[PDB]
Amino acid sequence: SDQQLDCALDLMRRLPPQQIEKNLSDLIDLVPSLCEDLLSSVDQPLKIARDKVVGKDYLLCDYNRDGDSYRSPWSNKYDPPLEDGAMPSARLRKLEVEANNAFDQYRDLYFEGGVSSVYLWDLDHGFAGVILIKKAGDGSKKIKGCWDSIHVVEVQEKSSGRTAHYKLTSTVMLWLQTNKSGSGTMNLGGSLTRQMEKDETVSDCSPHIANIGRLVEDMENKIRSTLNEIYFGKTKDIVNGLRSVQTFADKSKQEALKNDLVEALKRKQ
Amino acid sequence: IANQPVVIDNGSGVIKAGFAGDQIPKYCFPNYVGRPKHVRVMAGALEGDIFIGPKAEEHRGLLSIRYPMEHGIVKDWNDMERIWQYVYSKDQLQTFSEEHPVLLTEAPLNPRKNRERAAEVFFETFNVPALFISMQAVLSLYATGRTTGVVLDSGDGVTHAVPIYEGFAMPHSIMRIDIAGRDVSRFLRLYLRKEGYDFHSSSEFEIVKAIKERACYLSINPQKDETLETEKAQYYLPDGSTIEIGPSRFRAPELLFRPDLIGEESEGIHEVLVFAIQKSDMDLRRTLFSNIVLSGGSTLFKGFGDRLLSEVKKLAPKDVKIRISAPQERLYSTWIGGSILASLDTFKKMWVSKKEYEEDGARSIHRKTF
Amino acid sequence: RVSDEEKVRIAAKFITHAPPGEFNEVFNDVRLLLNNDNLLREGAAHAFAQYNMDQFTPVKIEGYEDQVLITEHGDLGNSRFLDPRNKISFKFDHLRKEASDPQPEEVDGSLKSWRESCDSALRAYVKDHYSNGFCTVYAKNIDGQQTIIACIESHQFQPKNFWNGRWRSEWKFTITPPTAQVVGVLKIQVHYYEDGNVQLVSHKDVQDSVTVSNEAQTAKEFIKIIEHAENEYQTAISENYQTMSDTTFKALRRQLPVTRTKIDWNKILSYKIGKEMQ
Numbered sequence: 001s002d003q004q005l006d007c008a009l010d011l012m013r014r015l016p017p018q019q020i021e022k023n024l025s026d027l028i029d030l031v032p033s034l035c036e037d038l039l040s041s042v043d044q045p046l047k048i049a050r051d052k053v054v055g056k057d058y059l060l061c062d063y064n065r066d067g068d069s070y071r072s073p074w075s076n077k078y079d080p081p082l083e084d085g086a087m088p089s090a091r092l093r094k095l096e097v098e099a100n101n102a103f104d105q106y107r108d109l110y111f112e113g114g115v116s117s118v119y120l121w122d123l124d125h126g127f128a129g130v131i132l133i134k135k136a137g138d139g140s141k142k143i144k145g146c147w148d149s150i151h152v153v154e155v156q157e158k159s160s161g162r163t164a165h166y167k168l169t170s171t172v173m174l175w176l177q178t179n180k181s182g183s184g185t186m187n188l189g190g191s192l193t194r195q196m197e198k199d200e201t202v203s204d205c206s207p208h209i210a211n212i213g214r215l216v217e218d219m220e221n222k223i224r225s226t227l228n229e230i231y232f233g234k235t236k237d238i239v240n241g242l243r244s245v246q247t248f249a250d251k252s253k254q255e256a257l258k259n260d261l262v263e264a265l266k267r268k269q
Numbered sequence: 270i271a272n273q274p275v276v277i278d279n280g281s282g283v284i285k286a287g288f289a290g291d292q293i294p295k296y297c298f299p300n301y302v303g304r305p306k307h308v309r310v311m312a313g314a315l316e317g318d319i320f321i322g323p324k325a326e327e328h329r330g331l332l333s334i335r336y337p338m339e340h341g342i343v344k345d346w347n348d349m350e351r352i353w354q355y356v357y358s359k360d361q362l363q364t365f366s367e368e369h370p371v372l373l374t375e376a377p378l379n380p381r382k383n384r385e386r387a388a389e390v391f392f393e394t395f396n397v398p399a400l401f402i403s404m405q406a407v408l409s410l411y412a413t414g415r416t417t418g419v420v421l422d423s424g425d426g427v428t429h430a431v432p433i434y435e436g437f438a439m440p441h442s443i444m445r446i447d448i449a450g451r452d453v454s455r456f457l458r459l460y461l462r463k464e465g466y467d468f469h470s471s472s473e474f475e476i477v478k479a480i481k482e483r484a485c486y487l488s489i490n491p492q493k494d495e496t497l498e499t500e501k502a503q504y505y506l507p508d509g510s511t512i513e514i515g516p517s518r519f520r521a522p523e524l525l526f527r528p529d530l531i532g533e534e535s536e537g538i539h540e541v542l543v544f545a546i547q548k549s550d551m552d553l554r555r556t557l558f559s560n561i562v563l564s565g566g567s568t569l570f571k572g573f574g575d576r577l578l579s580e581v582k583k584l585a586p587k588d589v590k591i592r593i594s595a596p597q598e599r600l601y602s603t604w605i606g607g608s609i610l611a612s613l614d615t616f617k618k619m620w621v622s623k624k625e626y627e628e629d630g631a632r633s634i635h636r637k638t639f
Numbered sequence: 640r641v642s643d644e645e646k647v648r649i650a651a652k653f654i655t656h657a658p659p660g661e662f663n664e665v666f667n668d669v670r671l672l673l674n675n676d677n678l679l680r681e682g683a684a685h686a687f688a689q690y691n692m693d694q695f696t697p698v699k700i701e702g703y704e705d706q707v708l709i710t711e712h713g714d715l716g717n718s719r720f721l722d723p724r725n726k727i728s729f730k731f732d733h734l735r736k737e738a739s740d741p742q743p744e745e746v747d748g749s750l751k752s753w754r755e756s757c758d759s760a761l762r763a764y765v766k767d768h769y770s771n772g773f774c775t776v777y778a779k780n781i782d783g784q785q786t787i788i789a790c791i792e793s794h795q796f797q798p799k800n801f802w803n804g805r806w807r808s809e810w811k812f813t814i815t816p817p818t819a820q821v822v823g824v825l826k827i828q829v830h831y832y833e834d835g836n837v838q839l840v841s842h843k844d845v846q847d848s849v850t851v852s853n854e855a856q857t858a859k860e861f862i863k864i865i866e867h868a869e870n871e872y873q874t875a876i877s878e879n880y881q882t883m884s885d886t887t888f889k890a891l892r893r894q895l896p897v898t899r900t901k902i903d904w905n906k907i908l909s910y911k912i913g914k915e916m917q
């Protein structure tokens with residue numbers, strides 16, 4: 001049970017992420033008794049249903065999914081449309097619509113299209129809200145991608161001093177299917193995941209939508225840059241380590257001069 | 270060659286130059302190109318008119334001063350050569366290229382083209398027989414004597430975190446950003462553009478940079494110190510013109526931490542430094558935590574390193590012992606190390622002779638640089 | 640109830656697609672999953688052999704020290720792996736790196752010495768360019784052509800550093816003086832996994848056509864072609880880091896907005912900040 005669960009999670013880390021849905025299907029076919037555990041750990045990738053009455057292609061998650069009935073973040077139409085289930089507060093319903101519109105604009109601010117849906121479900125001292133953003137790949141080019149922004153905010157409003165504790169769950173996926181000749185059949189999928197706390201003020205000028213949107217902006221750019229620098233420079237070092245371009249015996253004399261530098265360091269210190 | 274080797278402290282904002290053995294660069298004057306602004310009429314009006322130094326600082330309002338080292342990269346190549354001739358002149362060197370050995374320094378992530386063009390100067394126009402283009406961060410390590418240190422320069426158009434190991438950095442874990450106090454001070458002037466101060470000349474802006482070096486700092490609390498209302502301390506121009514300062518003094522350096530103030534595709538040089546350190550082994554990161562070296566000139570603000578410390582505490586994990594060395598000749602730390610390496614006579618193999626250029630050009634430098 | 644044969648196929652597939660170095664660990668994980676060693680080893684034995692073949696496992700027989708990459712041109716079918724570099728066939732435990740009893744191989748020679756010269760120059764280069772994993776040029780005089788199968792491979796496995804890089808470079812060539820073709824691939828398998836999986840895989844399908852004059856004459860020439868394709872492609876990838884870093888990134892997810900300044904949702908929600916005219 002636990003041995004298969006742990007080996008399954010680390011195996012998903014080891015398995016090719018291009019088949020995550022099919023890999024998980026193969027995993028359920030292997031051990032179906034640990035199906036929901038792996039579904040809870042590794043959530044579903046971004047699926048899109050259409051809010052036909054509102055004309056909104058909306059992302060699919062666990063929270064909108066009333067059982068197995070995906071709530072639209074605009075019309076609250078389940079998929080299949082049920083009558084009772086995933087329901088935020090009425091004020092939270094309208095606030096959710098506002099947040100969805102503004103974050104669709106955010107998706108246009110960084111993606112200039114795509115599908116994004118934020119789902120909310122009220123609670124007393126704050127609540128939890130899942131933030132989702134999906135974008136396709138460069139169809140105009142040889143590089144393909146499947147943007148999978150999976151985010152969950154831990155809204156914890158504090159009545160004292162109108163602040164609100166937040167801890168946005170971070171999880172972003174995208175493909176780097178660059179099939180360029182200079183890149184070869186190069187593909188990469190950053191199955192990223194982070195989270196960090198903050199207590200932000202909720203006001204008329206800084207409401208929940210604005211607060212969380214700012215944190216989203218911050219977190220996304222930070223993680224994205226962290227990948228681009230740390231991970232990609234690291235892979236560059238890996239590229240140089242597996243295959244060096246410079247022939248040796250050239251670097252040897254340079255290292256001998258390096259030894260002489262250390263010698264001089266000892267000559268003075 | 271049996272002469273005192275020339276050390277060239279390639280400062281972005283303030284370039285310097287000197288020799289071996291010394292601790293302060295023999296001749297100091299910043300990096301700029303001061304072109305004229307009028308036409309000679311009276312016999313007594315000097316000629317050449319693209320003056321540097323005493324005439325520049327003297328007649329700031331008469332010289333259209335420009336800057337070649339844009340983004341830490343010289344654009345007025347030929348003019349910089351003539352600035353070296355200004356150094357070669359009776360003012361600073363009083364010698365020739367062919368006489369003294371020379372040592373050029375460099376920042377990380379530099380394009381080869383600049384190095385090649387420089388070598389063209391060095392061995393064609395100038396004809397130094399003993400010269401090689403070295404780095405700058407390792408020179409600050411020579412100054413500190415440290416081995417596993419992170420060097421952070423602070424110039425005008427360059428900012429780089431260099432995680433070094435015994436004077437031999439991982440040429441991959443190093444990060445480099447080509448922006449500092451130039452546009453930051455321009456942005457501070459932009460703050461004053463809102464309050465009516467668009468005094469556009471660079472020499473007129475040199476005064477603003479004198480304020481940058483003088484009436485500016487880094488408040489650790491970002492919004493708690495920015496959103497409040499200041500006292501607007503006054504400043505007086507060379508004539509003594511009253512100009513208030515306000516919050517701008519610490520608002521503008523936030524650009525280095527929040528590039529969104531100018532819209533730069535950077536992420537805060539502090540985070541970039543964190544990432545420069547994070548591109549190595551954890552224990553090597555510990556060694557770099559123990560040795561944090563600062564260079565350049567913009568390392569002279571109040572709460573500069575303090576706000577940096579706070580940022581690292583809010584970003585880096587636990588137990589990160591941020592041991593930041595705070596020397597004073599951070600500008601000259603690179604020069605100090607150049608004088609140190611210049612004193613090292615092992616440089617014979619490390620240099621590039623004139624015939625070495627004749628047979629390799631700059632390929633020899635690219636084969637010997639690290 | 641689900642049939643275990645599906646698990647056999649899925650297991651063999653995933654074990655052939657296992658990360659480099661973590662292959663046996665992947666096999667251990669799958670053994671912890673199914674725990675039916677018979678059905679496991681059914682597709683897993685071929686997964687072992689096939690993984691060694693495609694992944695170019697550099698098995699090194701101690702009595703010869705060849706570091707021969709495992710491919711399809713080495714086995715005798717009964718685990719005995721021929722060596723194009725030293726004319727010996729040794730049995731090999733596919734489940735491990737365990738090899739045994741290298742029996743000499745009376746083979747062609749009209750190509751073996753030729754690839755030995757090529758492999759000598761390639762080994763001198765590759766060892767100055769690789770650290771963990773090297774080259775192995777297979778030979779075969781099939782279809783009236785002295786077919787050079789220059790298989791090259793590189794890796795380094797640092798799970799402490801959380802990465803398992805892997806390089807492979809199979810080159811297809813036929814010594815047919817003078818019309819010969821330098822065909823080749825430059826397979827990559829980078830496996831970083833800490834806090835974001837980085838399973839980077841690429842290659843470079845290239846086909847050149849060199850003229851075969853002599854053994855040592857065109858040996859270094861063929862190696863030079865491979866050499867330049869390696870240097871060029873690695874250079875292209877180094878440039879690809881920057882070009883993708885900005886182009887691909889901002890193309891999919893922008894770094895800053897179009898205005899690049901700041902996103903203030905307060906003023907955005909206020910007045911409906913631009914949906915009126917824009």
Ligand SMILES: Nc1ncnc2c1ncn2[C@@H]1O[C@H](COP(=O)(O)OP(=O)(O)O)[C@@H](O)[C@H]1O
Pocket residue numbers: 279280281282283284422423424425427450451478481482483564565566567568569570600
């Ligand atoms: N006291 C100071 N306070 C703040 N900034 C300073 C001070 N002195 C110098 N600077 C900044 O450092 C710059 C000097 O550039 P420099 O550090 O020589 O370039 P490099 O980093 O290439 O050596 C100046 O442009 C100035 O903006």
